Design a protein around this ligand. Structure first.
Ligand SMILES: [Mg+2]
Ligand SMILES: [Mg+2]
Ligand SMILES: [Mg+2]
Ligand SMILES: [Mg+2]
Ligand SMILES: [Mg+2]
Ligand SMILES: [Mg+2]
Ligand SMILES: [Mg+2]
Ligand SMILES: [Mg+2]
Ligand SMILES: [Mg+2]
Ligand SMILES: [Mg+2]
Ligand SMILES: [Mg+2]
Ligand SMILES: [Mg+2]
Ligand SMILES: [Mg+2]
Ligand SMILES: [Mg+2]
Ligand SMILES: [Mg+2]
Ligand SMILES: [Mg+2]
Ligand SMILES: [Mg+2]
Ligand SMILES: [Mg+2]
Ligand SMILES: [Mg+2]
Ligand SMILES: [Mg+2]
Ligand SMILES: [Mg+2]
Lengths: 185, 260, 243, 173, 134
RNA sequence: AUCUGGUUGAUCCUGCCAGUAGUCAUAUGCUUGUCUCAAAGAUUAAGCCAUGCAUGUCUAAGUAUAAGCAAUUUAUACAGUGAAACUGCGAAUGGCUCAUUAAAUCAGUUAUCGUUUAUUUGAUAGUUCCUUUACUACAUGGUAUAACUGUGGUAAUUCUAGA
RNA sequence: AUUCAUAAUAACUUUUCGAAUCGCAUGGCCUUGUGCUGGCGAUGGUUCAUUCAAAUUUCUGCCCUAUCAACUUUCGAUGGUAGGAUAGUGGCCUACCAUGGUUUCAACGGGUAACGGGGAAUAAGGGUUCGAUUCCGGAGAGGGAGCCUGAGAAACGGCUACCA
């Protein structure tokens, strides 16, 4: 006797397991963006899919019907806040045409490398999970943050971080102590 | 089971209390009283969930035990007292007066009330009848029995009641073209004028109602509750005035009250 | 199911701990710097019986301990840990083998490990993994449980039947292992159970002829039993015939 | 150990279902009954103890009995019970005749006394006065209400006869 | 370079429980989160009440750091605080004392043994001493 | 909104076997660092159970001569606190399991002009000794009882007897 | 929609209820009797109403099986009258009458490793398969039966008996 804590899966494993084409596509996709599981890809494929379903289910209904209007506009403006859907494509028929990379391109991981705070994408990984990289007043340490558009123009280093400001890290002051003590001697 | 149940599980509580579903496992089963379980609000809910005046349950008992909280002029000290529709609630230490009337969205709403409106109360007349020694009386929805009413008052009529003496000030008849709050059902929380009453014998009467935006709907007579006259209500309606808007209209109204 | 239950009662009547029982538990530490007398002390101090502990310190190594909590007749045996073959001989007659483990000292690759393996090969009934040295490490539980679990994963390797190395330092686990020793029915080792065996409590000798006589042996029979006509073996003595 | 029970005319033991107001039993729970062994009423060779009362004193004194005497633990608590224990008139105030006890502690010796029950005091007279009051007051108020209502009713019927007068004059015209 | 800033939001004046309740924001950069004691001190001066007439709890330091939210009440006197607050809080503030009562297990066991005694029991004590001397 | 290998010398078929994917579904093997969260003796044996606990309850406001505690400041009826016990209320809720059960249960929907209802809430009550203003407690009848005092029984119980 | 509510007559009754109760304040008014009055609230109490219920109840809906085709009625099966019982309708039971009631639109019987539903898994759709289990309803407390107390139990952290 509680309420039963609801919960759900997030991804979905491919239907054909060994398919030299899908295999590769996936690998290059992990490569552009430095993902670690294929699972990271699947998660995207899956959200995408739920959106394509909502999309169609709206599409089959009459234009100027309250529901298609309401949920349509919502789905649209939601897709826009994260800048997955461009400003000009603001009509359902494009949200179908959406593909995976359009989602993979809004990760904090990605935007860190495309706002040039990192040297390579992998660098951006490390830098994120290292508690270095803030979005405004918040630190964020998940590579999958999914940057909204109005939060693009705030991403910087953490006021906590060595690069952001503050004091040097543990290694730095370790070597500072080593050289200072070795010279005092 | 064997006797009456004394608990209420969390999920099984009437939804429009808006109890969150991880706070506990139980929910304040309303005591026996003036109103039906399903459609009443236990004071603890009104006090801790809707006024935020107390954080726990025992804080609420604490409050109630100083004879602070009145209901219909009188002091109740039962955490699970069932204050339902159109009841007056008095918090003297804040010098506030509340009325339990339905929000547009079918739930109970906080409503501040002047001292001059707190004095009285409306009551749907659920049944008139003749009691012992031939003395005629009415029974009004909040359970109140009133003796020697005016013979013009039959069923479904509303009655104004001085909370002080418990006597009948005046009343209102159930005729076409009156103002009306709809209490039970889906359209619960709406207000409008009664177009015409549909009469089905041995079954449920319906009522067509047309609101102030000249839109129409239908409910059983069971949920129709008379207020007053065209734009001349006897009680003060909340904001919203019992006018229900499509989700589009509400979306727009909300996004149009944002300019910082 | 009634048949099953009947049969089970019949098979659990060999240890009617009031008159006809003899549960042999052998205590085998696997670490040099460890005391078996102590391990017993824990198990019987958690039975709240100070007398049966004090009466054993004076002079003994084999005990007839009756527990009243569970109503059971245990027989405890502690081996000469200087003789390997005496350890093997001790365990190979047991209904239960307790293993002492050190929180301080890692078990020896050349000795204690070989105890494990050899016991395991010759035959073991029901075995248990138990500790005593756990308090010798840090006072905070956070570090003790580490040792405990590493020991659990070491002990699981040779004895996968078990997953819980019990800690006698805590009253609960000690009460629980005692509980098991009392209640739980001990599994069977094929070759020893099919020819019978008696552990001797009292051994007296009667002279009949000047050059030979009659060894008298008072003990409880376990296994298949003995016949007067069949021979009896006695370890490091040979095969002899019954009179 | 099983006790004898008055009623059971038998020189042995027999199991009974005992209830609320009987011997040999105390109901643990409301309305509960129980089956218990009980000893017969007729004395035999098995009885460990026989419980006896003295009705007529004999010629000789009994040491542990007649020689000693024990005071009754508690005196009266109700007003008229007191009045019977001291044979007082109706007009004698019971307050003074109340038994007290002299308890001792430290260097102080304090005295206790039972609360008098059913004792006529100004308070109960007040409450009774209040009862006659609210009853009569209520009755008169009620008569007032039915009078006002009958007045209303009678005026409405006359209004109805005037209306029917107007309608009869309009139908005749 | 710290600057402990203490903000009080969603404030309500509650005469029913003779107190004012509110949310507590705390901006504490470089600071490894602020002690509750300290907080009470700094709130007292602000709402002009005794340090004992103020209560704060439920503080949760945000992710990454340099901030934390909690909740805070402040009564009209310390009398009322003493009579309205939950006791364990008044133990956190020393304003009352933890009452040493035995374990739950224990207490229940005593209750249960005492169930098996009808009456005062000094009777049974005289009787059992008597039957033991016997 | 997908299939692939297997009958033949080779071919196209019917056809299955095999393979493949899911299970917010059990078990098991091997492996296992961190956050949040969560189910867990249902399946077979509604099989059996040591011990401990899960149901008790008192306010300004039912009953206190504890031969209890506090003494103390007005109380010689009581009057602070209060074990015990009588009274009152509860123990019919909760929790568990899924054995029974196939128009049964249950779902939705009706009915009670076909009934009971502690409780809550609201109303609700001049009439209740003999004669006609004379006679009988209404400034208020009566009795048992417990706890307790003391005497006892029995291996034993949450046994109880006599006074 | 009523023989309803209610009223009236005539009587009836091992005569139901109609405050011998409690805590706080202690005041008015006089013929000066310590006389008559007098606030707030607690508990109780009859009836009606209300609330919480409860019990019955109408329509429609359940998995497999014809290697189950006829089933129900002495012993209630279906209906009528009257009674008895029940809080109450009612073959619920008892007398007395009838001779009915179900059935290839699958009754009756057998099976279920069957509690029912809200729901779960999976499918483009249509489906197939799960639902002991967090909410609702029901049933049971080793198996049967019986009953006290009480508004409410055929109760088992109540009682009684038989069987294990
Ligand atoms: Mg239940
Ligand atoms: Mg409805
Ligand atoms: Mg297959
Ligand atoms: Mg089971
Ligand atoms: Mg379970
Ligand atoms: Mg008191
Ligand atoms: Mg009432
Ligand atoms: Mg008498
Ligand atoms: Mg018949
Ligand atoms: Mg009939
Ligand atoms: Mg079943
Ligand atoms: Mg398909
Ligand atoms: Mg289910
Ligand atoms: Mg099952
Ligand atoms: Mg259930
Ligand atoms: Mg039951
Ligand atoms: Mg069982
Ligand atoms: Mg009861
Ligand atoms: Mg039963
Ligand atoms: Mg039980
Ligand atoms: Mg139960």
């Amino acid at each position: 006797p509680r309420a039963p804590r609801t919960y759900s899966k997030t991804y979905s494993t491919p239907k054909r397991p060994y398919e030299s084409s899908r295999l590769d596509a996936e690998l290059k996709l992990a490569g552009e963006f430095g993902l670690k599981n294929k699972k990271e890809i699947y998660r995207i494929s899956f959200q995408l899919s739920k959106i394509r379903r909502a999309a169609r289910d709206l599409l089959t209904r009459d234009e100027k019907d309250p529901k298609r209007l309401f949920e349509g506009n919502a789905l649209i403006r939601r897709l826009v806040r994260v800048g997955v859907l461009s400003e000009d494509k603001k009509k359902l028929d494009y949200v179908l045409a959406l593909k995976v990379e359009d989602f993979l391109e809004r990760r904090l991981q990605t935007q860190v490398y495309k706002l040039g705070l990192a040297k390579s994408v992998h660098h951006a990984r490390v830098l994120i999970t290292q508690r270095h990289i803030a979005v405004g007043k918040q630190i964020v340490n998940i590579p999958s943050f999914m940057v909204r558009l109005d939060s693009e123009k705030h991403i910087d280093f953490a006021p906590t971080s060595p690069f952001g400001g503050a004091r040097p890290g543990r290694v730095a002051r370790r070597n500072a102590a080593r050289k200072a003590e070795a010279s005092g001697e | 089971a064997r006797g009456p149940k004394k608990h209420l599980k969390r999920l099984a509580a009437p939804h429009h209390w808006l109890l969150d579903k991880l706070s506990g496992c139980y929910a304040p089963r309303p005591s026996a009283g003036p109103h039906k379980l399903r459609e009443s609000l236990p004071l603890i809910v009104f006090l801790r969930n809707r006024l935020k005046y107390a954080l726990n349950g025992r804080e609420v008992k604490a409050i109630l035990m100083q004879r602070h909280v009145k209901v219909d002029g009188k002091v109740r000290t039962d955490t699970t007292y069932p204050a339902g529709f159109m009841d007056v609630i008095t918090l003297d230490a804040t010098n506030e007066n509340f009325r339990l009337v339905y929000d547009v969205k079918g739930r109970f709403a906080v409503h501040r009330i002047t001292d001059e409106e707190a004095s009285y109360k409306l009551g749907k007349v659920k049944k008139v009848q003749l009691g012992k020694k031939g003395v005629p009386y009415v029974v009004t929805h909040d359970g109140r029995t009133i003796r020697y009413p005016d013979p013009n008052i039959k069923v479904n009529d509303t009655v104004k009641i001085d909370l002080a003496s418990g006597k009948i000030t005046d009343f209102i008849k159930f005729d076409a073209g009156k103002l009306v709050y709809v209490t039970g059902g889906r359209n619960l929380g709406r207000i409008g004028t009664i177009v015409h009453k549909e009469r089905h014998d041995g079954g449920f009467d319906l009522v067509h109602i047309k609101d102030s935006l000249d839109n129409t709907f239908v409910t059983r007579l069971n949920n129709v509750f008379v207020i007053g006259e065209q734009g001349k209500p006897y009680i003060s309606l909340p904001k919203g005035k019992g006018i229900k808007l499509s989700i589009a209209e509400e979306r727009d109204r909300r996004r149009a009250q944002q300019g910082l | 199911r009634a048949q099953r239950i009947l049969d089970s009662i019949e098979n659990r009547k060999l240890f009617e701990g009031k008159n006809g029982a003899a549960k042999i538990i052998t205590i085998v530490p696997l670490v040099n710097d460890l005391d078996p007398l102590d391990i017993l002390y824990k198990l019987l101090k958690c039975a709240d019986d100070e007398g049966i502990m004090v009466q054993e310190v004076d002079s003994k190594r084999i005990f007839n301990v009756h527990i009243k909590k569970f109503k059971s007749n245990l027989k405890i045996i502690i081996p000469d840990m200087t003789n390997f073959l005496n350890i093997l001989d001790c365990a190979k007659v047991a209904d239960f083998v307790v293993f002492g483990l050190s929180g301080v000292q890692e078990v020896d690759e050349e000795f204690g490990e070989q105890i494990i393996r050899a016991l395991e090969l010759q035959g073991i009934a029901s075995y248990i993994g138990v500790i005593s040295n756990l308090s010798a490490v840090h006072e905070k539980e956070k570090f003790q449980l580490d040792v405990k679990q590493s020991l659990e994963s070491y002990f699981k390797h040779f004895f996968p039947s078990e997953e819980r190395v019990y800690n006698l330092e805590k009253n609960s686990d000690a009460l629980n292992v005692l509980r098991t020793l009392c209640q739980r029915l001990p599994r069977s080792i094929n070759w020893r159970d099919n020819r019978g065996y008696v552990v001797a409590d009292f051994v007296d000798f009667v002279e009949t002829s000047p050059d030979s006589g009659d060894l008298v042996i008072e003990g409880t029979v376990r296994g298949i039993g003995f016949n007067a006509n069949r021979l009896v073996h006695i370890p490091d003595f040979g095969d002899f015939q019954l009179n | 150990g099983f006790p004898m029970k008055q009623g059971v005319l038998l020189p042995t033991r027999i199991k009974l279902l005992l209830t609320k107001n009987v011997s040999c039993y105390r109901p643990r729970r409301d309305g509960e009954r129980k089956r218990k062994s009980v000893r017969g009423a007729i004395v035999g060779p098995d009885l460990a103890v026989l419980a006896l009362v003295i009705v007529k004193k004999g010629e000789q004194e009994l040491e542990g009995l007649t020689d000693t005497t024990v005071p009754k633990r508690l005196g009266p608590k109700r007003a008229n019970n007191i009045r019977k224990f001291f044979g007082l008139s109706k007009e004698d105030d019971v307050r003074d005749f109340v038994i007290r006890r002299e308890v001792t502690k430290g260097e102080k010796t304090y005295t206790k006394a039972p609360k008098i029950q059913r004792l006529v005091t100004p308070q109960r007279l007040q409450r009774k006065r209040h009862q006659r009051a609210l009853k009569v007051r209520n009755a008169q108020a009620q008569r007032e209400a039915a009078a006002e209502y009958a007045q209303l009713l009678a005026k409405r019927l006359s209004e109805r006869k005037a209306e029917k007068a107007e309608i009869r004059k309009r139908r005749a015209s | 370079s710290d600057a402990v800033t203490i903000r009080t939001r969603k404030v309500i004046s509650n005469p029913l429980l003779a107190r004012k309740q509110f949310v507590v924001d705390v901006l504490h950069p470089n600071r490894a989160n602020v002690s509750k004691d300290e907080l009470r001190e700094k709130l007292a001066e602000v709402y002009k009440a005794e340090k004992d007439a103020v209560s704060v709890f439920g503080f949760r330091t945000q992710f990454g750091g340099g901030k934390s939210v909690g909740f805070g009440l402040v009564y009209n006197s310390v009398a009322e605080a003493k009579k309205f607050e939950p006791t364990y809080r008044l133990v956190r503030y020393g304003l009352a004392e933890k009452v040493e009562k035995a374990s739950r297990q224990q207490r229940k066991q005593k209750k249960n043994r005492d169930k098996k005694i009808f009456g005062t029991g000094k009777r049974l004590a005289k009787k059992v001493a008597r039957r033991n001397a016997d």
